[PDB]
Structure formats: structure tokens, C-alpha cells
Amino acid sequence: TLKNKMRITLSLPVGALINCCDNSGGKNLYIIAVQGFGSCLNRLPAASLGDMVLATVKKGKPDLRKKVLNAIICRQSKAWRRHEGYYIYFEDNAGVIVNPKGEMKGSAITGPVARECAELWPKLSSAASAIV
């Protein structure tokens, strides 16, 4: 319950296909909109690590497909600066399917999870096995 996210370099605009990195059944997430995005004329809404987005799954369980659902970004392949002084990037883009309230639909995270996302979403960090 603290949303002082601190600015992370925007990656993953609308239309990005990322991995699901959870056991919910989905295999990929098609970013559809970014929560909290305001109004700029030709600006594509874009998301960062701690961001909740709206997405549809294109590969995965039919029960999950063809629907609008919420996801939280966990891994971002674009380098971002954390204030310690260096730049960090994963090798893939990945987010987990969550309830609009922010609670996971699956039970476990496959790969590492960004610390910035982990401290924004507490019950997500518990499911995370490795927080980097």
C-alpha cells in the first residue's frame, strides 16, 4: 500500500507481446492499455516494471483467451536506471495476470522479478521465487 513507484524508463507501448511468466495458463500477453495513462495527442500508452496494464492473451488456455484482463509487468528488456548508479535490463519482457485489485490469478512466477515491481506489489513478491 504505497504507490511512490519512482520513474522507470517507459518500455512496452500498446501492442507489445510479452511473456506471461506465471502458471495461470496463458503463454503471452498483448498489452492493450496502460492504467493511469493520461492525454497526449499521438503518444502511445507505454508501461514500465511496476505498471498495471490491460492485456489479452493470444496463446494459452481458451478460458483465458478472447478477454480483457489485468496484468502487472515484471521483467523489462529495455535498460532502466536505478538510482544506485547503474543501468539494468532483463533479456525478455514478461508480466503476470492479476485481478484488478492486483492479486495474482496464478500461483507462482517462473523467472526473476524486478525489485521495483516486487515492492509495489507485496503479494506478488511472495509468489516470486527470485527478486532481482
Binding site: 519512482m6 538510482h83 544506485e84 548508479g85
Partner: peptide, 19 residues
């Protein structure tokens, strides 16, 4: 660039050292 220790309570930086 310099490294300094942040003293902003309630901030995500706080006791950490930033560049």
C-alpha cells in the same frame, strides 16, 4: 557525478546511496 546518501523519510530511496 557524485554519490550521496539520501535522507528523505517516506521515499523509496531514503537510506540508500544514489548517484
Amino acid at each position: 557525478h557524485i554519490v550521496r546518501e539520501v535522507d528523505k523519510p517516506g521515499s523509496k530511496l531514503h537510506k540508500k546511496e544514489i548517484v
